[PDB]
Design a protein around this ligand. Structure first.
Ligand code: HEM
Ligand SMILES: COc1cccc(CO)c1O
Length: 403
């Protein structure tokens, strides 16, 4: 429709998944709010527009089309009003900073050690599969009450949900171009139900300290629980993003550090710099790159575009975090970048609920890794490929060290 952006008609889903940064560099200059045909939606690409939409009184949450097809209702990310308030009150207790501080070290550090012990003497490893993902899912899985679900299984589930939720491509008529791509999301949900339904059966009668048990019981009248159909979509939200993203963030941080060997040495020497390293890692390759959205509730003008009521806008926070209006040479990882606001945790009433927890998981994981393997080196025989438009991170991270 917009004539000067006719080139967007030729952007493909595969291109965006392999590397979205060239398209979005053009969008940030040409059209900070732009309709992207293959995505079937307006996309916000700059920090100013993403923050405005995410915080505007004239927008509310909406799930992406493929997200809705996968998760259904009421996913915490796609609802508003009283239901959203209830789901936030449901998830927030275990994520409160004073609560996290009571137990985060005893949760994550033994897990990180357990996975590290399996390879720390090998001289080689693929850190995504052998460390970053397992620590992320085992930590959250235990908190949730999924101790008996193997980390291999939790990792398979968030891979399948990832592909289903980001199966966004639409055809000439605005219909999903790849409908068969939702089948593995449906199969993941069926497997999750088979595992989690018995656990919920038990928690209803025998509550414990698991987070899901508290989701069922907290704030409810005596003898009542939240219906499982009311909480399952948020369970799925967790089994995707909350399981995947801390692993993504640690891995991207390491890749960035490896790209700046002088900076990797600083952080290994001085582990108090790990939080700063992680913050730059999240800006540099945002794990949740473009997975959430808002919808206008009345006619509104954003970045010169007159939007009718009912218009969805995807928030490409990963692009916003490369806004050259804010950052110098944003495509380069720089630990010594001045600490500035970023949008990797979103903004507004639907901003990330688990920031404090996530930052500690990533921190502890990197602390233990650098303690166990101070001479870590990237395996330069294998390149690092990043994949993902909706969620983005490295597909593998081959490293070596002198044993
Ligand atoms: C580095 C790791 C993580 C990153 C980068 C991340 C980022 C985000 C982003 C971008 C959103 C959408 C915000 C928006 O639409 O404005 C979000 C939502 C959310 N995240 Fe995080 N997340 C991470 C880890 C986690 C973890 C571990 C948990 C739970 C233990 C969690 C819980 C949630 C919840 C519940 C929401 C939905 C909030 C709502 O819609 O009201 N996140 N996250
Ligand atoms: C915490 O998990 C998520 C956060 C934001 C988006 C999604 C899925 O679109 C998630 O699963």
């Amino acid at each position: 429709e917009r004539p000067d952006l006719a080139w967007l008609d030729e952007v493909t889903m595969t291109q965006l998944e392999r590397n979205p940064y060239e398209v979005y560099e053009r969008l940030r200059a040409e059209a900070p709010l732009a309709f992207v045909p293959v995505l079937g939606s307006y996309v916000a690409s700059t920090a100013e527009v993403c923050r405005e939409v995410a915080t505007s009184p004239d927008f509310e949450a909406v799930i992406t089309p493929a997200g809705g097809r996968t998760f259904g209702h009421p996913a915490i990310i796609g609802v508003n009003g009283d239901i959203h308030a209830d789901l936030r009150s449901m998830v927030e207790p275990a994520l409160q900073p004073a609560e996290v501080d009571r137990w985060i070290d005893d949760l994550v550090r033994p897990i990180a050690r357990r996975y590290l012990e399996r390879f720390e003497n090998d001289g080689h490893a693929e850190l995504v599969a052998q460390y970053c993902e397992p620590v992320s899912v085992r930590s959250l899985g235990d908190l949730l009450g999924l101790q008996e679900v193997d980390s291999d299984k939790l990792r398979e589930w968030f891979a399948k949900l990832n592909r289903s939720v980001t199966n966004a491509a639409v055809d000439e008529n605005g219909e999903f171009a790849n409908p068969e791509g939702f089948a593995e999301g449906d199969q993941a949900k069926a497997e999750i139900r088979a595992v989690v339904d018995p656990l919920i059966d038990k928690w209803i009668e025998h509550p414990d300290d698991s987070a899901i048990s508290h989701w069922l019981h907290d704030g409810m009248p005596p003898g009542q629980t939240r219906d499982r159909e009311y909480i399952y979509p948020t369970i799925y939200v967790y089994l995707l993003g909350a399981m995947q993203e801390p692993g993504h963030g640690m891995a991207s941080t390491l890749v960035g550090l490896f790209s700046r060997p002088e900076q990797l040495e600083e952080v290994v020497d001085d582990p108090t710099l790990i939080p700063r390293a992680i913050a730059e890692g999240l800006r540099w390759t945002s794990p949740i790159w473009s997975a959430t959205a808002r919808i206008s509730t009345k006619p509104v003008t954003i970045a010169g575009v007159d939007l009718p009521a009912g218009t969805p806008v995807m928030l490409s926070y990963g692009s916003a975090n490369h806004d050259t209006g804010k950052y110098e040479a944003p495509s380069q990882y720089d630990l010594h970048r001045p600490p500035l606001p970023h949008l990797a945790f979103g903004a507004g009433n639907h901003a990330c609920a688990g920031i404090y927890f996530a930052n500690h998981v990533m921190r502890i994981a990197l602390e233990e890794l650098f303690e166990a393997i101070p001479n870590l080196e990237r395996d330069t025989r294998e390149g690092v490929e990043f994949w993902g438009w909706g969620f983005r991170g490295p597909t593998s991270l081959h490293v070596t060290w002198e044993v």
